[PDB]
Write a protein that binds this ligand. Structure first.
Ligand code: ATP
Ligand code: X15
Ligand code: CL
Ligand code: NA
Length: 416
């Protein structure tokens, strides 16, 4: 994917300020970083810039989904600056904004070797181009303000590097809108794209996709194209309830539900049938009376339904058996999205059981690819990072590659 693009190995950085988009959207629990994978993954590009004489490296990322409102109490990148220091062996200056005159002054003429991390890009609606105000009402960014936002970011370096593989599916301002003469892909971008190019060229079959998690509105829209590439699909985690409500008339309580995706569920199942893709949905659940680690818990099946005011936060044991059967048939697996709220032990058994099966599959020759901010944290939590074929920093980004697309963050790089 980058044979035609400028990459960092061929970018002259000596004496240049480098502005670098990274994916530092790391998971957090009790206000601390629970997995530094995405930060560590950018260190090779950052160190390369410094070792080869860069005047500065300005790092920019989002964290979470603050929807264009400053939320430094909940989604500040300040903790990431602290963690990056230990991983880099070098000092990092944190700025409390990402644009404006104070940021521009701090980045205009830095001391040699300076590393600077900006605040969450998504505190400004101009990054995504849309969001919500502080009262929760949806809002769209104004074109002239988007261009001024992109112009401000562009002043923070002389050359641009994009190492944000995990965000490469997003055509956001920091990812496609920086206007500098040289825009290069970083070493993590290259590593991930190269791995997927080889693994997706002629997959081992049956090729199973496992789609879970909580980003239902976004990821239900990826299934249509994925159904032209895979032979089996597990639809689990928060994704399943939209399917079960529509197909089975199941009562789902307060479980995650996507109104727009519900309108295409039957068409997706029809396409799966046309293409010979076996769909495995859960059949039982661990329920909770509220979205809380210490919620009261219960059990439910598709036939029983989930009680009003309760939500399904994990699959149950009969679902785990069906998931295991699909893993045993697979010769290649791509997995994005845990099949329950694995961060909370009451709701982690289903994801742990599936991880055990995927590890066993790897040991008998299955090619196993696990990707995503939270899904890769499953590998860290249960110590399986070296027991699957590849742990990717991309989740949705990897699914969009599976669909067969050129990612916007790659398309926007300079051509050779
Ligand atoms: N039934 C469920 N209800 C609610 N949340 C769920 C459920 N099952 C899983 N989750 C949540 O899904 C979240 C992860 O979903 P998400 O799509 O963000 O995955 P990801 O691997 O981080 O992907 P990406 O890299 O694209 O962000 C986890 O925090 C987990 O708690
Ligand atoms: O976490 C990401 O994607 P992912 O959840 O699929 O791994 C990226 O940081 C992009 O975040 P977004 O899905 O809020 O745009
Ligand atoms: Cl979403
Ligand atoms: Na996530």
């Amino acid at each position: 994917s980058l044979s035609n693009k400028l990459t960092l190995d061929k970018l002259d950085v000596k004496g240049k300020r480098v502005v670098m988009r990274v994916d530092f959207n790391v998971p957090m629990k009790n206000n601390q970083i629970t997995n530094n994978q995405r930060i560590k993954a950018a260190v090779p590009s950052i160190k390369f810039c410094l070792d080869n004489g860069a005047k500065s490296v300005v790092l920019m990322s989002h964290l979470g989904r603050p929807d264009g409102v400053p939320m430094p109490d909940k989604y500040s990148l300040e903790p990431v600056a602290v963690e990056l220091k230990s991983l880099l062996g070098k000092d990092v200056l944190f700025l409390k904004d990402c644009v404006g005159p104070e940021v521009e002054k701090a980045c205009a003429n830095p001391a040699a070797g300076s590393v600077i991390l900006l605040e969450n890009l998504r505190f400004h609606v101009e990054e995504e181009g849309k969001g919500k105000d502080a009262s929760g009402n949806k809002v769209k960014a104004e074109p002239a303000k988007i261009e001024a936002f992109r112009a401000s970011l562009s002043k923070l370096g002389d050359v641009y590097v994009n190492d944000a593989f995990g965000t490469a599916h997003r055509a956001h301002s920091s990812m496609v809108g920086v206007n500098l003469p040289q825009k290069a892909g970083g070493f993590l971008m290259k590593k991930e794209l190269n791995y997927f190019a080889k693994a997706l060229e002629s997959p081992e079959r049956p090729f199973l996709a496992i789609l879970g998690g909580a980003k239902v509105a976004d990821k239900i829209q990826l299934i249509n194209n994925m159904l032209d590439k895979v032979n089996e699909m597990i639809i689990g985690g928060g994704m399943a309830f939209t399917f079960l409500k529509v197909l089975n008339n199941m009562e789902i309580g307060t479980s995650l539900f996507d109104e727009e995706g519900a309108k295409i569920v039957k068409d997706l199942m029809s396409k799966a049938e046309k293409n010979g893709v076996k769909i495995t949905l859960p059949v039982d659940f661990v329920t909770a009376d509220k979205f809380d680690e210490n919620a009261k818990t219960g059990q439910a099946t598709v036939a029983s339904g989930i009680p009003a005011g309760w939500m399904g936060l994990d699959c149950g044991p009969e679902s785990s058996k069906k998931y295991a059967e699909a893993v045993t048939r697979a010769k290649q697996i791509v997995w994005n999205g845990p099949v329950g709220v694995f961060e909370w032990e009451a709701f982690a058994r289903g994801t742990k059981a599936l991880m055990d099966e995927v590890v066993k599959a790897t040991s008998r020759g299955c090619i196993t690819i696990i990707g995503g901010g939270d899904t890769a944290t499953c590998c860290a939590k249960w110590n399986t990072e070296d027991k699957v074929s590849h742990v990717s920093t991309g989740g949705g980004a990897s699914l969009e590659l599976l669909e067969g697309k050129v990612l916007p963050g790659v398309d926007a790089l300079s051509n050779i």
